[PDB]
Amino acid sequence: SATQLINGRTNLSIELEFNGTSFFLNWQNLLNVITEPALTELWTSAEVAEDLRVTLKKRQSLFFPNKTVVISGDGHRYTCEVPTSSQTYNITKGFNYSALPGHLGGFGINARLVLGDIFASKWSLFARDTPEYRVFYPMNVMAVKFSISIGNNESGVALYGVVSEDFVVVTLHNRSKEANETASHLLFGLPDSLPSLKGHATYDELTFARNAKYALVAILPKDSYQTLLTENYTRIFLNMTESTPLEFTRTIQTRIVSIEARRACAAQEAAPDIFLVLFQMLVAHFLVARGIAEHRFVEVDCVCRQYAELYFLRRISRLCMPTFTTVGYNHTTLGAVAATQIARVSATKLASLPRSSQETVLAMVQLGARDGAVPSSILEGIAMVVEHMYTAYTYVYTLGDTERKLMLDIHTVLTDSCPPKDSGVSEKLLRTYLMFTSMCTNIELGEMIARFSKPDSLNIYRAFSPCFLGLRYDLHGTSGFAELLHALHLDSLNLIPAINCSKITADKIIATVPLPHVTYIISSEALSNAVVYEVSEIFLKSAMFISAIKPDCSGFNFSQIDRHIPIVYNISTPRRGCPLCDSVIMSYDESDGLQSLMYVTNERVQTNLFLDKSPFFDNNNLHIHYLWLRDNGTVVEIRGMY
Amino acid sequence: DIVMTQSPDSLSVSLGERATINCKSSQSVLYSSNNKNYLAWYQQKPGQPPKLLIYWASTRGSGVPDRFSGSGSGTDFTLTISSLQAEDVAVYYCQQYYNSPRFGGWTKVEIK
C-alpha cells in the first residue's frame, strides 16, 4: 500500500529510446545513502507533472551571465600547519589537557576536531515556505547560520546566510507585505557539491566566475527590483580570491567602516551593499575553514590568531547590526585547550614576554572567554602588562604599532568579561582603567578625531588608542565608531557603578578618577553626597565641578571648603625615596575643559613626566593651570611652569 | 598563476668550478605567516625520476650531497654548487607551493 513495500522491484531503470543501451539504478542505494523522507520530499518538490509553460516562465524570470570566466585560480594560502616537528597531539576521547606543554600554543591539534567544532549544528534549509523552494532543492546543511534580519515594518530583508565547509549561501528575502518574494541568492564554493537547482536553471549557465577550485553563482531573478545587477561579478571574484588573507580582512573591515560612513549600517535603502558585504564575510569564513580543513594537524597559535581576526570582523559587523546573529558554532576543544594553556601563565610571565608572545596568549584568552570566564590571574597579567607598557610609554610619550594591536586585544578580552569574584582583582582592573584614561591625552584624542573622519584609508586594527579603554567621557562622511567602541567597556566595566551611593545621571560627567579608597567625579554638574571644589576662574562660559566620594559610602572627613586658588611654588622636582606615588595629576585649560590626566606607580614615572618630550609643559597659551591630587580627598592647586 | 623564468637554460663550467643556477617566480612565494620561502629545487638526469634538493629555499634536503646549497628569498633563488663533479651532470627545476605548483623551465649543466 504505502511506501514501506511499494518498491517490490529489484531496481529502477532509465531508458533512452533512440539508443539501444539500458541504464540502471539500484533501488536500495538511494534509500540508504539519502533518507526516505528526503527522497519523498525530493520527488514532491520536483513538480514532476508541472506544465512546461510554467517552467518556461520560471526560466525567463531569471537573469543569466555571458560565460563562466575561468582564471588561473587556486587563490592564496590560508592554511597553516605544524613547523615540521613533533608538537602534534591526537585528542582521542578526553585526553587530559594538563599534558599540553608550553604557554604559547606552539603545539598542534587535530584539524578535523576543530572542523567539527566550528560546524556542529544541523539545519534543514530550503523549507516548504521559503522562496528557496522554487530555486533550490531541499537539503540538510550542517553549518554556522548567520542572520542580519533588518526590519519588520514591511521592510526588513531577511539575509539569512549560511557557511558550510563546502559552500556558502546567502539570501535577500524581500518579505515586504505580500506572498511574492525577490529571493536573490548568492552561492560560493566547490562547483561539484552545491544545492541542486530545479528544472528551470543550471549551473553551467549560472556560474558567473570560475577558478581551479572555487565557483561563484548568482541566482537572482531579473524581473525583481535589483539595481545590484549592474556590477562586475568578475571584479568581486578577483578581489575575493587573489588577495592575501590579511588583505581580504582589511578590505572587509574598510567596507564595513564605509557602511558606517553613511547610515547604511542601520538603514534599508542600502540593502544590496549590506548583502554583498555579508557575502564577503561568509566566504572569508569559508576560506578559513577550508584552509584549516586542508591539513590534518593545525597549529593552535595561527588558528587562534585567525579566530581573533574573524571574531573582530563579527564584532564590528554586530556594531553596525544589533540584530546580527551567529549560531551553530561550538569552539569546545579549542576553548578547553586555551583554558588549560593559559592557566600556566603567571601574571609576571605575561608582562615579561615580548610583544609578539603577548598577542598569542591574549588571543587564546579571547577564544576561551567568549562567555566572560577570563581567569583573575590573567586579569592581573593584563594589569601589569599595561603597567609595563605604560612605563615604556612614559619615556617619549609616543605610541607604536604592536602596543596598539595588543591594547585592542585586551580591550576585546575585557569587553566580553563577566565581573570577577575577588574585590582586589576588580580594584586592580579599575586601577588599569585609571592608567588607560591617563594614557589618553589631548594629542591622542586629536589623533582619533582626525583619524576616524577618513574611513577610506582607515584600518581599525592599527587605528586603536587608549581612549577606547579609558575612563574619559568627552568623546566629542565621518565614522561614528568612537562611542560604538567606548560602550563595549562602559557598560561592562566589571562592577559598572564605580559610584555606589550618590547615583547621578551620567550626562555631563567628563572624568572619573578611581584612586584607592577614594573616587573623584569631574563633571560640569554636581553631585549631592558631600562638598565639592569649584574653580574661581570662571570668567568664560564653562563649569568645572569635582567631588570626592568614598567607596565605603561615607561623607567627607573634613568640611573645609576652598572656593579659591592657592598659589605657591612648592614641591619642585622631588627627592629620592617615594615622595609622590599612587596619586594622580590633572591638567585643565580655560578654553577646552579637561586636557589630560596622569597616574604614577613607580619612581620612573615621576622622574619621567619632567621631560621636554612630554605632552605637558608646552607654550600653547600663556595661562595653563595644573592640579595636585592625592588619595585622601584634598585639592591643592599648583602654579608654575618649571 | 606564478611561473618560473629559469635562466640560463644551458651553462657549462669546468670541473670543480662554482655553478650558479637561478630561478625567478612571478610573485612572492614568501608566506607572511610562517615567514618562510615556499620553493624547492629538483635534479633530474635523464633516465630516472627527479630528486629533491632544497626544502624552503634555505633548508637542505635529506640525503643530498653537501655541495649544493639553497639561497635567495622572495622572487630570487639560487642553487649554488660548491664544486661540480662528473656525476653531477643533470637538469634542474624549481617549483613553488604557495599557489598551485608550477615548475620552472630547464637548465642542463655541461662539461667543457
Partner: nanobody, 121 residues
Amino acid sequence: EVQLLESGGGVVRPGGSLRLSCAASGFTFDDYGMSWVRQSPGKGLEWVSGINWNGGSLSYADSIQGRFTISRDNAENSLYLQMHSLRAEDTALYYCARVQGSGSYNNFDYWGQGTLVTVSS
C-alpha cells in the same frame, strides 16, 4: 624507504578514458597526500592534480581543469586519476609523488618509477 609504482599505462585513442593507478606502500598513507606530474619527452615536467590527506579539497591545473578527476582512498593504498576527452598533446610520462605534509600540494620528496601514456592513431 618508500617506493611508488604506477600501473595501467598504454596507448589510448583520441578523446577517451584511462585509469592511472599509483600504489603507494612502505609508509602511512593517510598523513601525506599525493600528486600527479607528467613528463612530456620534449619538455621536462609539469604538475597535473593534487589530493589532500582525506580527499575533500582537490587542487587542479588550469588547461586541464574539469577533464581530470583524481580519487584517492585513505583505507586501501591506492591513488587513481581519470582523464576525460583528453586531447592529442596530452602525451607524457606520468608520475605519482609523495607530497610532504597534509596539504594538496607541497615539495615532493619521493617520486614514482613512472608509466607513460600516449594519444596516437
